[PDB]
Each structure stands twice: as C-alpha cells, then as structure tokens.
C-alpha cells in the first residue's frame, strides 16, 4: 500500500481550492469528481482517511 503518488495529488487540490480556483478535478478509478470551496471540509477528511490506509499504526494517537 503506497498512496505516496495519488496522495501528493490530493494535497495540490488544497492549494488550488484555497489559492483562487474554486473548481478542482481528480482522476480516481477512471472517474472524475468535482469539489467546491463549499466542501473544503469533507475533503480534509478524505486526506486523513488516506493517511490511515497508507500509514503504519492503529492506536490513532500516532
């Protein structure tokens, strides 16, 4: 399990959505999905869930 690549792509979305552009697309499973500054919150979670699926712990306090 190494989302090291797609991971770097998600961080970029945080930079473009809060730098100016309000729209951002992501290539996931041949499926493209849109995100607007209105959901900048549900995206923050998508970034936290991938760190737990690529990290190496479980106590959560890690």
| Contact (CB, 8 A) for 24 and 35 | yes
CA 21, CA 30: separation in Å to the nearest integer? 23
CA 47, CA 29: separation in Å to the nearest integer? 17
Q: Which residues in the chain are followed by a discontinuity, with C-to-N distance exceeding 2.5 angstroms?
A: none
H/E run at residue 45: helix 40-54
Residue with tokens 């989302």: 3
CATH of 1-62, one of 1.10.10.10, 3.30.1580.10, 3.40.50.10490, 1.10.3720.10: 3.30.1580.10
- DSSP SS3 for 39: helix
Give the rounded distance of the alpha carbon of 45 from its chain centre.
8
Structure determination method: NMR
**Residues with Cβ < 8 Å from 4, sequence gap 6 or more?**
54
Identify the CA nearest to 22 among candidates 7, 47, 41, 39. 39
For helices 40-54 and 4-19, angle between their N-to-C axes, nearest 10 degrees = 160
Domain ranges of the chain: 1-62
């Amino acid at each position: 399990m190494v989302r090291q690549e797609e991971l770097a792509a998600a961080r970029a979305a945080l930079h473009d959505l809060m730098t100016g552009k309000r729209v951002a697309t992501v290539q996931k499973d041949g499926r493209r999905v849109e995100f607007t500054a209105t959901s900048v919150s549900d995206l923050k979670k998508y970034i936290a869930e991938l760190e737990v699926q690529t990290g190496m712990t479980q106590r959560r306090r890690g």
